[PDB]
Design a protein around this ligand. Sequence first.
Ligand SMILES: CC(=O)N[C@@H]1[C@@H](O[C@H](C)C(=O)O)[C@H](O[C@@H]2O[C@H](CO)[C@@H](O)[C@H](O)[C@H]2NC(C)=O)[C@@H](CO)O[C@H]1O
Ligand SMILES: [Cl-]
Ligand SMILES: [Cl-]
Ligand SMILES: [Cl-]
Ligand SMILES: [Cl-]
Ligand SMILES: [Cl-]
Ligand SMILES: [Cl-]
Ligand SMILES: [Cl-]
Ligand SMILES: [Cl-]
Ligand SMILES: [Cl-]
Ligand SMILES: [Cl-]
Ligand SMILES: [Cl-]
Length: 223
Amino acid sequence: AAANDVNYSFDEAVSMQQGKGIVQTKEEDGKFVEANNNEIAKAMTISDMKYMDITEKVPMSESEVNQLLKGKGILENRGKVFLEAQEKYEVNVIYLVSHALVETGNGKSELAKGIKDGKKRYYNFFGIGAFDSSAVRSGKSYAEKEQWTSPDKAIIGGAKFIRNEYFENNQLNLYQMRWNPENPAQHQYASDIRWADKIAKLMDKSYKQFGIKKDDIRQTYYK
Ligand SMILES: CC(=O)N[C@@H]1[C@@H](O[C@H](C)C(=O)O)[C@H](O[C@@H]2O[C@H](CO)[C@@H](O)[C@H](O)[C@H]2NC(C)=O)[C@@H](CO)O[C@H]1O
Ligand SMILES: [Cl-]
Ligand SMILES: [Cl-]
Ligand SMILES: [Cl-]
Ligand SMILES: [Cl-]
Ligand SMILES: [Cl-]
Ligand SMILES: [Cl-]
Ligand SMILES: [Cl-]
Ligand SMILES: [Cl-]
Ligand SMILES: [Cl-]
Ligand SMILES: [Cl-]
Ligand SMILES: [Cl-]
């Protein structure tokens, strides 16, 4: 019956995002530092790729997706699998590619080449859970738990996670994934205050490259 997810005033949400121990980071002078309170408040202000529903699909062929992935390292020539993910889980493939490209350094980062454990290697292209050497051997790594033992398994698995844990939790766009205005400071995808902006920028370029129509835009989150 109750389908109202507007729960907090903006000032209430800001105070929550500024709460004790909550990690909020900003890229400065070549690396990540903790964001200050003013920066957090500014980052979460509403200004529109960041506000667009990414739980719908877009008309991109495997050829078009591989065009986007050309020259993208470990992600090059994996468009078939990104589209398997889109259709299986109803995840916007432009969003999915853009998120992967941000997180993996255009597919070229050292971490994108995975983490060794025994005879296997684990991959993670979406910043999901703990992903470093210690977590993998300790077994306390989501990528290991889900057995993302290849790049293709990491693409499909990443989409599954986003659908099941975010889209099914009513976090339908980048803003909601980052700032969870229905329940501020819980279940947020990333600590980088500009996480949504980085993904949205690549999304917008790809939308304009292929002439893709935008899905629903929502700008009301707060009382
Ligand atoms: C996708 C991912 O793993 N993101 C990290 C994020 O975890 C989210 C919430 C997730 O598992 O989907 C993580 O957020 C913290 O997660 C711990 C559980 O691991 C929670 O106890 C904290 O409440 C979370 N904080 C917030 C604000 O949601 C953050 C922590 O910086 O890192 C993300 O990369
Ligand atoms: Cl603190
Ligand atoms: Cl946190
Ligand atoms: Cl094609
Ligand atoms: Cl690197
Ligand atoms: Cl990420
Ligand atoms: Cl984990
Ligand atoms: Cl939540
Ligand atoms: Cl944002
Ligand atoms: Cl334009
Ligand atoms: Cl379209
Ligand atoms: Cl609002």
